Amino acid sequence: TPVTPYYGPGHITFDWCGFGDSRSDCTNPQSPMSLDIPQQLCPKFSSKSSSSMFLSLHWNNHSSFVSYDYFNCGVEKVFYEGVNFSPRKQYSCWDEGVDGWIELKTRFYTKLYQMATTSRCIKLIQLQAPSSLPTLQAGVCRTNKQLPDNPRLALLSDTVPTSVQFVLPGSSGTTICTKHLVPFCYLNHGCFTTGGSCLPFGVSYVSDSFYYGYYDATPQIGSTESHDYVCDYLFMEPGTYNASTVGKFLVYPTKSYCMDTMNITVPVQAVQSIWSEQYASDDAIGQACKAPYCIFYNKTTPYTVTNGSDANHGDDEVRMMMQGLLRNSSCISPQGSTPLALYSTEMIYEPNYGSCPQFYKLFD
Amino acid sequence: TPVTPYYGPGHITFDWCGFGDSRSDCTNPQSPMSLDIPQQLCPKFSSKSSSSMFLSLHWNNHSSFVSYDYFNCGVEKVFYEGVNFSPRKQYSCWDEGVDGWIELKTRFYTKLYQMATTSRCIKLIQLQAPSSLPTLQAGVCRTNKQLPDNPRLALLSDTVPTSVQFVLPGSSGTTICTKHLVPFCYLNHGCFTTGGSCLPFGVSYVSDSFYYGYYDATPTESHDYVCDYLFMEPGTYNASTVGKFLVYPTKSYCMDTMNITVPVQAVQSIWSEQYASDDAIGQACKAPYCIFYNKTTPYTVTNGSDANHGDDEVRMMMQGLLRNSSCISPQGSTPLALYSTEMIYEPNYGSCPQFYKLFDTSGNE
Ligand SMILES: *[C@@H]1O[C@H](CO)[C@@H](O[C@@H]2O[C@H](CO)[C@@H](O[C@@H]3O[C@H](CO[C@H]4O[C@H](CO)[C@@H](O)[C@H](O)[C@@H]4O)[C@@H](O)[C@H](O[C@H]4O[C@H](CO)[C@@H](O)[C@H](O)[C@@H]4O)[C@@H]3O)[C@H](O)[C@H]2NC(C)=O)[C@H](O)[C@H]1NC(C)=O
Ligand SMILES: *[C@@H]1O[C@H](CO)[C@@H](O[C@@H]2O[C@H](CO)[C@@H](O[C@@H]3O[C@H](CO)[C@@H](O)[C@H](O[C@H]4O[C@H](CO)[C@@H](O)[C@H](O)[C@@H]4O)[C@@H]3O)[C@H](O)[C@H]2NC(C)=O)[C@H](O)[C@H]1NC(C)=O
Ligand SMILES: *[C@@H]1O[C@H](CO)[C@@H](O[C@@H]2O[C@H](CO)[C@@H](O[C@@H]3O[C@H](CO[C@H]4O[C@H](CO)[C@@H](O)[C@H](O)[C@@H]4O)[C@@H](O)[C@H](O)[C@@H]3O)[C@H](O)[C@H]2NC(C)=O)[C@H](O)[C@H]1NC(C)=O
Ligand SMILES: *[C@@H]1O[C@H](CO)[C@@H](O[C@@H]2O[C@H](CO)[C@@H](O[C@@H]3O[C@H](CO)[C@@H](O)[C@H](O)[C@@H]3O)[C@H](O)[C@H]2NC(C)=O)[C@H](O)[C@H]1NC(C)=O
Ligand SMILES: *[C@@H]1O[C@H](CO)[C@@H](O[C@@H]2O[C@H](CO)[C@@H](O)[C@H](O)[C@H]2NC(C)=O)[C@H](O)[C@H]1NC(C)=O
Ligand SMILES: *[C@@H]1O[C@H](CO)[C@@H](O[C@@H]2O[C@H](CO)[C@@H](O)[C@H](O)[C@H]2NC(C)=O)[C@H](O)[C@H]1NC(C)=O
Ligand SMILES: *[C@@H]1O[C@H](CO)[C@@H](O[C@@H]2O[C@H](CO)[C@@H](O)[C@H](O)[C@H]2NC(C)=O)[C@H](O)[C@H]1NC(C)=O
Ligand SMILES: *[C@@H]1O[C@H](CO)[C@@H](O)[C@H](O)[C@H]1NC(C)=O
Numbered sequence A: 001t002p003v004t005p006y007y008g009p010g011h012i013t014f015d016w017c018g019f020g021d022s023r024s025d026c027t028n029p030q031s032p033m034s035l036d037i038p039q040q041l042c043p044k045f046s047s048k049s050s051s052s053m054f055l056s057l058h059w060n061n062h063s064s065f066v067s068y069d070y071f072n073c074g075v076e077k078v079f080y081e082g083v084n085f086s087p088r089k090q091y092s093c094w095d096e097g098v099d100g101w102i103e104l105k106t107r108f109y110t111k112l113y114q115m116a117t118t119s120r121c122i123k124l125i126q127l128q129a130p131s132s133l134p135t136l137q138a139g140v141c142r143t144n145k146q147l148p149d150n151p152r153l154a155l156l157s158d159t160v161p162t163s164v165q166f167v168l169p170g171s172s173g174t175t176i177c178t179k180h181l182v183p184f185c186y187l188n189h190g191c192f193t194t195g196g197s198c199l200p201f202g203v204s205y206v207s208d209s210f211y212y213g214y215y216d217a218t219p220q221i222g223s224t225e226s227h228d229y230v231c232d233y234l235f236m237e238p239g240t241y242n243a244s245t246v247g248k249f250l251v252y253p254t255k256s257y258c259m260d261t262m263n264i265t266v267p268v269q270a271v272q273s274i275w276s277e278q279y280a281s282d283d284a285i286g287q288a289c290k291a292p293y294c295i296f297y298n299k300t301t302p303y304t305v306t307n308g309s310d311a312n313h314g315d316d317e318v319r320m321m322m323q324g325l326l327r328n329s330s331c332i333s334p335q336g337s338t339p340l341a342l343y344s345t346e347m348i349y350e351p352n353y354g355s356c357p358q359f360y361k362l363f364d
Numbered sequence B: 001t002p003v004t005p006y007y008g009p010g011h012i013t014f015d016w017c018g019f020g021d022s023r024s025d026c027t028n029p030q031s032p033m034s035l036d037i038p039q040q041l042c043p044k045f046s047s048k049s050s051s052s053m054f055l056s057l058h059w060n061n062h063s064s065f066v067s068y069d070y071f072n073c074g075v076e077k078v079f080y081e082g083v084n085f086s087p088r089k090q091y092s093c094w095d096e097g098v099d100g101w102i103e104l105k106t107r108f109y110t111k112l113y114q115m116a117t118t119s120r121c122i123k124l125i126q127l128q129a130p131s132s133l134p135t136l137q138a139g140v141c142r143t144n145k146q147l148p149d150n151p152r153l154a155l156l157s158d159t160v161p162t163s164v165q166f167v168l169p170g171s172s173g174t175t176i177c178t179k180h181l182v183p184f185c186y187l188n189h190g191c192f193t194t195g196g197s198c199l200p201f202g203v204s205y206v207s208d209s210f211y212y213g214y215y216d217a218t219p220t221e222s223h224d225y226v227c228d229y230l231f232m233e234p235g236t237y238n239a240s241t242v243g244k245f246l247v248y249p250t251k252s253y254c255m256d257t258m259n260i261t262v263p264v265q266a267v268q269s270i271w272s273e274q275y276a277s278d279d280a281i282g283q284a285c286k287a288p289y290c291i292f293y294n295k296t297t298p299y300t301v302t303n304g305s306d307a308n309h310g311d312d313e314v315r316m317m318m319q320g321l322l323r324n325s326s327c328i329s330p331q332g333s334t335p336l337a338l339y340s341t342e343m344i345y346e347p348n349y350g351s352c353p354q355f356y357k358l359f360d361t362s363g364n365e
């Protein structure tokens, strides 16, 4: 008798974990009305109300930034966060606009999901301040919104080449760090006018066996000088590195995602994380969560609360999807989960893993 | 009824293709004694004796380099080349050594296989020269071996920051190019002394939506030739320099898009034991994007054209491509069935049987 996949995420052994936001945070004063997951699954999630994994990479706590030290381990991984950095927030820093940060959000989750599939543990860590830091003036956003804390952007007193050393540790507590996801950011579009002349913007992360950099000294035309805050999200092995500069501008990381290694690749699972239609959302999660590294469980309805704490907590669709995490499944796929069975009532697509039933019509 | 994976590549549909070298080239004067594939499968392959996809990206024709215009389309893809750029060749250009070039080979194939999984067609194209080009002097290798023709490395007649424009086309003949695999290379390790000073080496590829760059001005003067293999959308780009050194691509792999992600298949491509091979293909061909079929024996010929054409093991493996298959995996191919007599691992695709022991009702298990 063919089985029907249950639409939503799932797990095949005990060794699974979740990463989330208010909708999976049982410490919320309105829990369990504010949850989209079953309450009994709160212990499987690393979650904080008003946070996201992207926001927490770039910022610590500020007036409208709730930063959380995300930390969890699992061969299988379910992500249900993201919404707390969306166009509703109206955030930009330099001239890149709100859409600029939705691109950076997309880049970050893309890299996080990829790196996650070869790791068990993922831990957001604070990095040590470099030793012997020269004098530094804090960077600012042109928008005067909060400058990211990571990576640090600061200004030296002079314009000559210099370098500071940062350490990506090989472990954090009992978590081994076989690699790090680290942001590399810069102000693009030519020379940057400060100290009374238009200076080259040139920064890099280097070691004996690593290089990533940016350089631009292109002159500005008339009064049109404009720069965007841009980031690339890098895979970096543990060890000691230099944050280098051709002068004036210094960029070095202050936080990273520490990850360990597991010897089998397993796609992660991401559930669409959006606001009600009162507010502006984006599709960064869906654009980041792509075969072969991520199984994306989209919503087919708006965020729709009939018995929750407010219009943005207690979506009926996601609540139904998350019931899938209560079962001990054999097959995980974009169609959802199944137990061990010969046949399926529908085609099972990729990515999938475990032992999956085959579409019954194939056997007539 | 139960099935057992047949070790070797395979195909589930009519829409498949191969990429290769002498060992799948029916134009070779010694064919079919020189083949490792069934002779009747030659028309499914884009192959040239003495070439590889890596070599052909970086070089056009020279006395030691047989460059081929690789081109083929298929949802499912079987790669069987690589050997014609191996440590046997002892190629290096600056101070990176032969190992340096094995690392670049590995980088290239990694990117090739990844990008191939969402493309149907793959076509090596000659890009047009930038329409405006100042006077240029060709770069050279310290070793005096042949400088790669792609990307071009050349020297302007002053140190003025400069850009030239290159075009990655939206199509080539009937093939649509939705993306391009393009090399970005540079000489690393500090400033480079020429024309009377130690000049910064700073080059980049830039558009309104794209930046990739390298810069170093820092103080034996040693340099390595280093490349990265970049995914780039069709369009016009600046090849920019902070002065003197100019790098721009002259060839790319043009690829289209298909709306499914299918792992590629790569078979180990090595020389006989008396020569130096590498495991770039094994290191490049990884889950989740590529299914690697390694050799378990040396390159061993009992009925072929020479000691390096007609391997018994690969010949047996390539018989898999004649089979009725519904499931393709690192264990090999099976036809449509309920149960497999052995465990099937990843990457795999199609409709795959489940491991028989999971359904045992004895229970002696
Ligand atoms: C690629 O490989 C696959 C897998 O091996 C092939 O698919 C199989 O093809 C065979 C042969 O056609 C199929 O087996 C045949 O099924 C026919 C229908 O059987 C159904 O209906 C009867 C009741 O009428 C049920 O009992 C049965 O369980 C099925 O529900 C039968 O007519 C065939 O019987 C033949 O063999 C018996 C032997 O005793 C004799 O009666 C006759 O000789 C008779 O011809 C047979 O059972 C099989 O179903 C397919 N398997 C799968 C898994 O789909 C592909 O054909 C092959 N493709 C190519 C191009 O080679
Ligand atoms: C590197 O150099 C080699 C030459 O040393 C070069 O290989 C040659 O390529 C050409 C064209 O791809 C081949 O010529 C063809 O050979 C086939 C026989 O198999 C003929 O059918 C072809 O004729 C048809 O097409 C012609 C147009 O090209 C028409 O003129 C004609 O009417 C036919 O329609 C054609 O002659 C040639 O066989 C190979 N030679 C070798 C030794 O491989 C290779 O292309 C060069 N690489 C690069 C990147 O330029
Ligand atoms: C494809 O198949 C190849 C042939 O089997 C594999 O070759 C193996 O490659 C690995 C490294 O990836 C080598 O491992 C090294 O082993 C040495 C010890 O060498 C000696 O002992 C081994 C085992 O008894 C023996 O195989 C050697 O010949 C030596 O006698 C260690 O010092 C290293 O740290 C490293 O672990 C294997 O040696 C090598 N085997 C052969 C026969 O060439 C290849 O790895 C396969 N590729 C993939 C992707 O699976
Ligand atoms: C930013 O500010 C908030 C406070 O406004 C900090 O939140 C606090 O974080 C700690 C450590 O996570 C929480 O303690 C934890 O409580 C749970 C559940 O009871 C327990 O299992 C943990 O082991 C831990 O003790 C604390 O409750 C929380 N406070 C509030 C009001 O939420 C947050 O850490 C700050 N972020 C950063 C990046 O510094
Ligand atoms: C997830 O589902 C949503 C809702 O269908 C998709 O968003 C729609 O995208 C289409 C096509 O671009 C637009 O016409 C709609 O107006 C969008 N609707 C909403 C509510 O935003 C979204 O693209 C899906 N994400 C992925 C990755 O498939
Ligand atoms: C709305 O949600 C509330 C909160 O979870 C539900 O209240 C629970 O209902 C069960 C029985 O169905 C009780 O055993 C629990 O004690 C209740 N919990 C709390 C915190 O009140 C309620 O059932 C839901 N209402 C509807 C109409 O579905
Ligand atoms: C290559 O770089 C040049 C020069 O830095 C860019 O030229 C500028 O582009 C815009 C047109 O969109 C003009 O308004 C500016 O006046 C141009 N500046 C100069 C000095 O000509 C050009 O856009 C770049 N080309 C590409 C394809 O990215
Ligand atoms: C890196 O920074 C340190 C300062 O801590 C400096 O001593 C060292 O020379 C730098 N290395 C390079 C290659 O710039």
Ligand SMILES: *[C@@H]1O[C@H](CO)[C@@H](O)[C@H](O)[C@H]1NC(C)=O
Binding pocket: B257, B258, B259
């Ligand atoms: C792929 O999907 C796009 C829309 O997402 C569509 O325009 C196109 O027809 C499809 N292309 C192919 C090759 O199937």
Ligand SMILES: *[C@@H]1O[C@H](CO)[C@@H](O)[C@H](O)[C@H]1NC(C)=O
Binding pocket: B032, B033, B303
């Ligand atoms: C050896 O190769 C020839 C030429 O293709 C073939 O016809 C013959 O069957 C082979 N001989 C043996 C013993 O396999």
